Amino acid sequence: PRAPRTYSKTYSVPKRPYESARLDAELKLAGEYGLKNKREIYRIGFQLSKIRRAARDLLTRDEKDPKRLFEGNALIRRLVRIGVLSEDKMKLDYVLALKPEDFLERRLQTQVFKLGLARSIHHARVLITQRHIAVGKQIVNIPSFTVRLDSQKHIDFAHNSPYGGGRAGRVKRKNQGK
Amino acid sequence: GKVHGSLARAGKVKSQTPKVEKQEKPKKPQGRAYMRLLYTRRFVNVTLTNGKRKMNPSPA
Amino acid sequence: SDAVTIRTRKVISNPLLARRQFVIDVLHPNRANVSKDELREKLAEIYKAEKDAVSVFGFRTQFGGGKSTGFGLIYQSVADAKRFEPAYRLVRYGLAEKVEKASRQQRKQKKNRDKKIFGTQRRAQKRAARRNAD
Amino acid sequence: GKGKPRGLNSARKLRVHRRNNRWADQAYKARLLGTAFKSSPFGGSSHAKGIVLEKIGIESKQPNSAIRKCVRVQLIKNGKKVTAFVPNDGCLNFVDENDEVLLAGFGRRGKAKGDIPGVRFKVVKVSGVSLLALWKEKKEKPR
Amino acid sequence: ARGPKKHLKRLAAPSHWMLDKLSGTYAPRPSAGPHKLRESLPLVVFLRNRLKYALNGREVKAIMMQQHVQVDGKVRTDTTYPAGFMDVITLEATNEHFRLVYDVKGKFAVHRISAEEAAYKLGKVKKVQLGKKGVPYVVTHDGRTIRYPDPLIRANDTVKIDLATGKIDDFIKFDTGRLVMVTGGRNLGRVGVIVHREKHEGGFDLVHIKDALENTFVTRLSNVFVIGTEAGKPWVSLPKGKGIKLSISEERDRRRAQQ
RNA sequence: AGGAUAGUGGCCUACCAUGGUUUCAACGGGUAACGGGGAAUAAGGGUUCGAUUCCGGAGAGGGAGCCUGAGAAACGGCUACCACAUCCAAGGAAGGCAGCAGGCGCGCAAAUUACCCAAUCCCGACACGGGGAGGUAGUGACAAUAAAUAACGAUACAGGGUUGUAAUUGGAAUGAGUACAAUGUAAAUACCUUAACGAGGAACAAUUGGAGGGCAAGUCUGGUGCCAGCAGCCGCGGUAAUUCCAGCUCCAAAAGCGUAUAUUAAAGUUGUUGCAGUUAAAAAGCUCGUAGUUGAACCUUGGGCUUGGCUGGCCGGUCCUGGACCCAGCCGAGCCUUUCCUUCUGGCCAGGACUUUUAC
Ligand SMILES: [Mg+2]
Ligand SMILES: [Mg+2]
Ligand SMILES: [Mg+2]
Ligand SMILES: [Mg+2]
Ligand SMILES: [Mg+2]
Ligand SMILES: [Mg+2]
Ligand SMILES: [Mg+2]
Ligand SMILES: [Mg+2]
Ligand SMILES: [Mg+2]
Ligand SMILES: [Mg+2]
Ligand SMILES: [Mg+2]
Ligand SMILES: [Mg+2]
Ligand SMILES: [Mg+2]
Ligand SMILES: [Mg+2]
Ligand SMILES: [Mg+2]
Ligand SMILES: [Mg+2]
Ligand SMILES: [Mg+2]
Ligand SMILES: [Mg+2]
Ligand SMILES: [Mg+2]
Ligand SMILES: [Mg+2]
Ligand SMILES: [Mg+2]
Ligand SMILES: [Mg+2]
Ligand SMILES: [Mg+2]
Ligand SMILES: [Mg+2]
Ligand SMILES: [Mg+2]
Ligand SMILES: [Mg+2]
Ligand SMILES: [Mg+2]
Ligand SMILES: [Mg+2]
Ligand SMILES: [Mg+2]
Ligand SMILES: [Mg+2]
Ligand SMILES: [Mg+2]
Ligand SMILES: [Mg+2]
Ligand SMILES: [Mg+2]
Ligand SMILES: [Mg+2]
Ligand SMILES: [Mg+2]
Ligand SMILES: [Mg+2]
Ligand SMILES: [Mg+2]
Ligand SMILES: [Mg+2]
Ligand SMILES: [Mg+2]
Ligand SMILES: [Mg+2]
Ligand SMILES: [Mg+2]
Ligand SMILES: [Mg+2]
Ligand SMILES: [Mg+2]
Ligand SMILES: [Mg+2]
Ligand SMILES: [Mg+2]
Ligand SMILES: [Mg+2]
Ligand SMILES: [Mg+2]
Ligand SMILES: [Mg+2]
Ligand SMILES: [Mg+2]
């Protein structure tokens, strides 16, 4: 038959379901970034948990090792590229010091509110879902879309959106046409 | 075990529980809105009694 | 508003099949999309070819609309196009008539029915008729 | 010298000694002896259907005092007779003699739970309809 | 298994064809021919996956049935014909001549050559022995049988085939210092000179090869194809990269500057 | 020695020896056993699984035997028997879904008797035919990805330095859905695009489990009263039950949530890493002893000389970057020390002759 298509899980749940010293921390963190549910918080911890695992393995090798130099710098370059890692912290020891708020900072939902295009963070998510925001010349409706540094400057309203020079929406057309 | 007994009393308490209807209360928000509701309720306007915090305070 | 804009990339000249082949980018803001028939007319104007030597297919509109990407063929002649084209595309363009045949079940059942006869059908049916004395 | 052999060429003794001694793990014996396959009423399955033989009722263990309302069920797959608890307030009235019931374990993985003696199964469905659906009036018994 | 296999599952095809997983259930099974199944390139892959001249399998059959494709100076119409190393493909409609030489990345490069170089080819001598009536003959890597060879020619040597008459123009004796391309193993496609031939009676002889960068690697004698009389003097034009293997860090650096 | 085979061979025959395997586990039995690539969990070491997208193997109800052919002990080929089983005019004849779809049965357990060769490839005398192989759709909460179920303002209060909410008041925004249409396709469906339609209780209404502890969240109200029931475990019910049945409120995860079973970690409760054995389970009553396991020390060390490469610097020779000279440090050589380092021809590469066996 046809070749199988690969797929994988993108999150992992806590070992202890009920622990206030984490439930409150998660909710405080979800409220700050306007997240829908706890799984969007589990997802950040999962990808940060395997980056740490990758970083530990390269750090055990000797310096100037070919694998440590190639993959460590490449992973760092991508992290600087998405704006998570600062240009003065490319040492793979500050990589271990990263925290989940660094990744939620680079989401499209976080950047739209923080760019002044929205009144609040919950306004940012609904603007994205309702096809109002375009990055470059492409409409993006994914709130978790991670903004790159070179794409940061090109965040604005969609060219055919009511708020960005487009036509009037469905509701307004119903009132002014009567 | 020595096992038997009258089967006549099945459902005794549930049958005689007086049926009480649920008041037709407003719907709760779903998704992102409900997490927003809980966050303020636990970190913005905290209702603590001098360190004394209750999620479901009985009317006492 | 309308402003249909056509860009061609990955152009390959293919004298093996007597045609030129390329990728088509269509920019159509304030327009749902452009029909293949309308794309074929415009291509004839741009490249000074007969409309019947031009073939487009496999179009998909990007997210948010306003742009589509597809594949296009331009043959050196209409005769060359008629030789090196799938039947279904010529039927799409009106250069051929859709062939009419029974369903696959009917062809297969008929094929297996003829398999029980050795020789001509005329011999088989006259002789089978002879058996049924009625 | 810690009692077990340590020599570099004593792998056969180490492999056999562990192999002999894992039989002391009761969980391990049941997996290799196939006791669930041989002795368990379900034959290793998670669930099993059967026919209700009789409504009886089981006296609870001390210090509790109650009548746990069960049924006697004959399994379709192997003809064995088992006792199955009927959970919730008044669900025994949903189960009649010569009804088809779907069973599952009590969750203690072959042992009895609580004060119910010698009962290791619970009723999940009757006549192909969930007992919980019958209890909460989501569905009605097909009869 | 009651008889020969006639299908090739997509996942079981040779990896150097660079076929995608999800395009279908099956892959083109190369026909019997001058080159081994695992070491060949079917003509369907070249015209559609490599040149991307054909859009599908229907189109490659239409191209070849009009007599356009020639391999080694004869028109071939077998869509799964196993073209291999040193084979010449001619498309006179497009006026293009190709030679199948491995690039250093292990794949068959799309290497266009001039018509002057496309008029001959090289073949590695597998065996020299006497035929019927005591006529000596040479078997090259593509199954050609050439009679009456130069009596100095031995196995593992490379001969220059006229490719129009099938005769031997001249040859290169197998010895230290000859230019070599590797036709097997993980060093496939690398180009260097023989440094040391390591003999093992009853086993596999090993050849020591020096890169143009004085990098040393070892490969089996069955993977050695003599292509030149000395360093820097190949008898055919090499593909882009000249068969020199770069490390991934050098490749990343090389890609960074070319942009 | 022969015969047979495509061919080696006790493969078989004739004659002849008495050999062959085995406690380093032969042989036999079991396997809820097709092998592997691989899967789940995983600090490490491990434990468990792999019928199933690829490779190899085996079978076509069970056996056995064959024809044709290069290739079959083939089964959508045949012959015979066994078990099933079909038509019959009673003389006879004909069967093989562990192919696709479908039916019965079995069960805890699994979808359409649909469209097409357009793609992927295969077969043929072949540019043309065929292909339930394969592709398309249908059923489909197996799993997997993203991700709606609302957002922003004004009043009115409260409030804290300038704004976070608790109520009743507005106008905006959008896709779920619908649909001209175009795209998609062999033809369709759907997706993606997109006119018009399509949101105030925005009834376009999120559920599943819980609220004594483990374990996050009630000593609220009513009902029952060792009954009914709950309760994985400890425990809860005899009149204000924090645990039942309900209502309210609250907690947890959410298009998902619970239950049963198996399995992995937790388990240093299988322990090589890494358990325990006086009394909690556990040193054979005591010696000998074969196999197994395991076994004291000892044979070229030191010194001297020359050289290759790279780290810190001084030099700095700075466009983060490069030199002899110098210091320490690190890796390799090449000679001499009574000197292992096989031995010869063309003259370190190619052509001859020798070599204690291993483990690492
Ligand atoms: Mg909490
Ligand atoms: Mg016929
Ligand atoms: Mg187990
Ligand atoms: Mg077993
Ligand atoms: Mg007890
Ligand atoms: Mg049932
Ligand atoms: Mg050839
Ligand atoms: Mg013999
Ligand atoms: Mg023989
Ligand atoms: Mg014998
Ligand atoms: Mg068996
Ligand atoms: Mg088996
Ligand atoms: Mg497998
Ligand atoms: Mg297995
Ligand atoms: Mg398998
Ligand atoms: Mg099985
Ligand atoms: Mg297979
Ligand atoms: Mg077979
Ligand atoms: Mg069968
Ligand atoms: Mg057979
Ligand atoms: Mg069959
Ligand atoms: Mg068959
Ligand atoms: Mg036959
Ligand atoms: Mg079937
Ligand atoms: Mg199922
Ligand atoms: Mg069905
Ligand atoms: Mg086809
Ligand atoms: Mg299929
Ligand atoms: Mg599809
Ligand atoms: Mg699900
Ligand atoms: Mg909803
Ligand atoms: Mg719709
Ligand atoms: Mg519709
Ligand atoms: Mg349109
Ligand atoms: Mg609830
Ligand atoms: Mg608590
Ligand atoms: Mg009360
Ligand atoms: Mg009371
Ligand atoms: Mg009370
Ligand atoms: Mg309480
Ligand atoms: Mg409780
Ligand atoms: Mg309650
Ligand atoms: Mg939640
Ligand atoms: Mg572990
Ligand atoms: Mg311990
Ligand atoms: Mg212990
Ligand atoms: Mg004692
Ligand atoms: Mg001994
Ligand atoms: Mg010693």
Curated annotation (Swiss-Prot), chain B:
Subcellular location: Cytoplasm
GO cellular component, one term: cytosolic small ribosomal subunit
Keyword hit for Ribosomal protein: yes
GO BP of this protein: translation
Keyword flag Ribosomal protein: yes
Pfam families cross-referenced by the UniProt entry: Ribosomal_S30 (PF04758)
Tree of life domain: Eukaryota
Keywords: Cytoplasm, Ribonucleoprotein, Ribosomal protein
Ranges where the record places region Disordered: 1-32
Record GO terms (molecular function): structural constituent of ribosome
Assembly notes: Component of the small ribosomal subunit. Mature ribosomes consist of a small (40S) and a large (60S) subunit. The 40S subunit contains about 32 different proteins and 1 molecule of RNA (18S). The 60S subunit contains 45 different proteins and 3 molecules of RNA (25S, 5.8S and 5S).
Record-stated family: Belongs to the eukaryotic ribosomal protein eS30 family.
Function: Component of the ribosome, a large ribonucleoprotein complex responsible for the synthesis of proteins in the cell. The small ribosomal subunit (SSU) binds messenger RNAs (mRNAs) and translates the encoded message by selecting cognate aminoacyl-transfer RNA (tRNA) molecules. The large subunit (LSU) contains the ribosomal catalytic site termed the peptidyl transferase center (PTC), which catalyzes the formation of peptide bonds, thereby polymerizing the amino acids delivered by tRNAs into a polypeptide chain.
Designated name of the protein: Small ribosomal subunit protein eS30
Originating organism: Candida albicans (strain SC5314 / ATCC MYA-2876) (Yeast)
Upper lineage: Eukaryota, Fungi, Dikarya, Ascomycota, Saccharomycotina
Gene: RPS30
From Swiss-Prot, chain E:
Gene name in the database record: RPS42
UniProt-listed HAMAP family: Ribosomal_eS4
Organism: Candida albicans (strain SC5314 / ATCC MYA-2876)
S-S bonds: none
Span of the signal peptide: none
The keyword Transit peptide belongs to this UniProt entry's keyword annotation: no
Compartments (UniProt record): Cytoplasm
Main location: cytoplasm
InterPro entries cross-referenced by the UniProt entry: KOW, Rib_uL2_dom2, Ribosomal_eS4, Ribosomal_eS4_C, Ribosomal_eS4_central_region, Ribosomal_eS4_central_sf, Ribosomal_eS4_KOW, Ribosomal_eS4_N
Domain S4 RNA-binding residues, every copy: 41-104
Role this protein plays: Component of the ribosome, a large ribonucleoprotein complex responsible for the synthesis of proteins in the cell. The small ribosomal subunit (SSU) binds messenger RNAs (mRNAs) and translates the encoded message by selecting cognate aminoacyl-transfer RNA (tRNA) molecules. The large subunit (LSU) contains the ribosomal catalytic site termed the peptidyl transferase center (PTC), which catalyzes the formation of peptide bonds, thereby polymerizing the amino acids delivered by tRNAs into a polypeptide chain.
Protein family per UniProt: Belongs to the eukaryotic ribosomal protein eS4 family.
Gene Ontology molecular function: any one: RNA binding
One of the record's GO cellular component terms: cytosolic small ribosomal subunit
Name of the molecule in the record: Small ribosomal subunit protein eS4
